[PDB]
């Protein structure tokens, strides 16, 4: 051949049990809003009801984990204390 690849340096991202398509706290969907929002709108204050991303790389509706921090505080899918780093998606 005329051009042959010798080296490569991809960077491979990874996702834990985020289950893209369901939230582990309320079980609704990665979208479709949450249990504390019901319909997509239903007074969602300009769609502020967004997804929250932990350091453990799990994902839930911001609302569903926020309310889980008024009772527990250690991420239900492992044991890590859980942080609030990345947001949205």
């Amino acid at each position: 051949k005329r051009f042959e690849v010798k080296k490569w340096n991809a960077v491979a991202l990874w996702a834990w049990d985020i289950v893209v398509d369901n939230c582990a706290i309320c079980r609704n969907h990665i979208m479709d809003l949450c249990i504390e929002c019901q319909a997509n709108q239903a007074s969602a204050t300009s769609e502020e009801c967004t997804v929250a991303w932990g350091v453990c790389n799990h994902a839930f509706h911001f609302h569903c984990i926020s309310r889980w921090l008024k009772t527990r505080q250690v991420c239900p899918l492992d044991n890590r204390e859980w942080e609030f780093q990345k947001y949205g998606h």
Binding site: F3, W14, D17
Partner: protein, 513 residues
């Protein structure tokens, strides 16, 4: 000459009252002379020039500054009358420097001039004012005044620190590097809107760590230490996050080298360098697209995915193209090219069959839009006499039916020639600026809510505007208070009983969870 002659008058009056007159009357003499002469002429000098304060500041005769400092120290309110004029001059120089006219200016030269003017101001302060507190606070407020302007001042500061951290070509030794870094963080001290600063600093970290390594390998510790000592442990945590990701993915690279020596099935894993990062620290570039993969990289990615699903179960990987690089071994000698995960698919399609066009690479490739056109231009448009992908219809704009060819270009005096069309002159186009502004706005809107729900659970309640003052004071060193935004956002959480904060029942807030 006025300062010298008035000093001579002061000295001669001192000895006159000490010998001819009674030395006990020294007080009222100082009174009359000092009071009248200096106070009346304070106005006349704040008003003049011709080798005056605003002229000696730009000329740089430090002896005059020291003389007037030691003279005006006796007259009351004189230090204020000179602080106001020097602050006016500094604000003029600032708004002349931070001017947005003349698009295309070099940002590193801009911040270099800013550092130069602040350094000459600080040296004139230390030599004349002897590290005075009033002058220091006035220049501090002056720096806080006009540095807030521009939606790009922290962005330009981040670009400057990136240019200074990528390679220490200028100032090979460590002393001047240390001094320039201290001056940089001092300049950053008198700057607001730290959120965009941290965002662009993290973006520059991602740009400098996901590229060719061995930039400094030691200055990262100094950078994180200065960040800890300057802003505090709040974003430096995410910084440690990123660096840890890096070193851990280096250990993962050695681990995968072992696991690849474990099978060696197909000729696709000749030389592999795969990096494993987390989304919690590294955000998506544009869309994380799903373009095709060349066959040997296909086999390499398949082997890596099988390994990561067999011995690292509990998580699945996602494929993308907007990150990384490669070394394309071309072949009178064998010169190895370089492709940054963008030209691999097009060059592979050319290897499979030459004489293609835009339709061929847009039909049988499942190619996105923006990055596709970007890479097309990077390879055939705006190229110096090192063209690796030529075409017959020579034109600036991109057509559809244009055949692509290849040229030798023996000007490469080595075997490792790279096409670094990416990371060009800092343009900061409107779409990327708007999207990062929206991102940082959402970040602020989430951080204010996090802060309010972390704080007001252990504090008292507000009636109309009591706790908003506290939530703005806690964020004073972060960014602007944005009264309208916070007022619109605090009334959105009322949807449920949790911290109702009802505008009707503002008498007692629910101290529950």
């Amino acid at each position: 000459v006025y300062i010298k002659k008035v000093e001579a008058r002061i000295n001669e009056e001192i000895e006159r009252v000490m010998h001819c007159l009674d030395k006990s009357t020294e007080e009222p003499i100082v009174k009359v002379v000092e009071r009248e002469l200096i106070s009346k002429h304070m106005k006349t000098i704040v008003e003049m020039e011709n080798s005056g304060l605003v002229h000696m500041l730009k000329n740089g005769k430090t002896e005059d500054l020291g003389c007037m400092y030691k003279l005006f120290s006796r007259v009351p309110n004189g230090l204020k009358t000179m602080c106001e004029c020097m602050s006016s001059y500094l604000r003029e120089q600032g708004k002349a420097l931070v001017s947005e006219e003349g698009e295309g200016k070099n940002p590193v030269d801009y911040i270099q001039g800013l550092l130069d003017l602040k350094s000459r101001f600080d040296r004139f302060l230390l030599e004349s004012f002897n590290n005075d507190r009033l002058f220091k606070q006035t220049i501090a407020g002056d720096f806080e005044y006009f540095l807030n302007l521009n939606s790009r001042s922290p962005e330009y500061l981040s670009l400057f620190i990136d240019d200074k951290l990528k390679k220490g070509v200028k100032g090979l030794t460590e002393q001047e590097v240390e001094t320039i870094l201290d001056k940089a963080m001092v300049l950053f001290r008198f700057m607001q809107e730290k959120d965009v600063f941290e965002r662009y600093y993290k973006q520059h970290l991602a740009r400098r760590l996901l590229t060719n390594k061995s930039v400094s390998d030691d200055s990262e510790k100094n950078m994180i230490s200065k960040l800890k000592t300057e802003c505090g442990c709040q974003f430096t945590s995410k910084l440690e996050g990123m660096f840890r990701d890096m070193s851990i993915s280096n250990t993962t690279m050695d681990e995968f080298r072992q696991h690849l020596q474990a099978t060696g099935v197909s000729l696709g894993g000749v030389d592999l360098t795969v990096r494993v990062l987390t989304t919690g620290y590294w955000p998506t570039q544009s869309a994380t697209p799903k373009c095709n993969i060349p066959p040997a990289p296909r086999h390499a990615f398949e082997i890596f995915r099988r390994f990561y699903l067999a011995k690292h179960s509990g998580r699945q990987l996602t494929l993308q193209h907007h990150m990384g690089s490669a070394d394309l071994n071309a072949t009178t000698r064998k010169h190895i090219l370089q492709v940054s995960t963008f030209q691999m698919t097009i060059l592979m399609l050319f290897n499979n069959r030459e004489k293609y066009t835009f339709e061929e690479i847009q039909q049988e490739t499942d190619i996105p839009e923006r990055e596709l056109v970007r890479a097309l231009q990077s390879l055939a448009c705006g190229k110096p006499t090192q063209r690796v992908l030529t075409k017959e219809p020579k034109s600036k704009e991109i057509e559809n039916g244009h055949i692509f060819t290849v040229n030798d270009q023996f000007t490469s005096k080595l075997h490792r020639v790279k096409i670094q069309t990416v990371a060009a002159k800092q343009g900061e186009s409107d779409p990327e600026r708007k999207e990062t502004r929206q991102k940082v706005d959402d970040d602020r809107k989430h951080e204010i809510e996090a802060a309010i729900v972390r704080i007001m659970k252990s504090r008292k309640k507000m009636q109309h505007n009591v706790l908003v003052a506290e939530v703005t004071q806690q964020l004073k060193a972060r960014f602007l208070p944005s009264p309208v935004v916070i007022k619109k956002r605090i009334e959105g959480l009322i949807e449920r009983e949790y911290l109702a904060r009802t505008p009707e029942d503002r008498k007692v807030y629910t101290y529950v969870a």
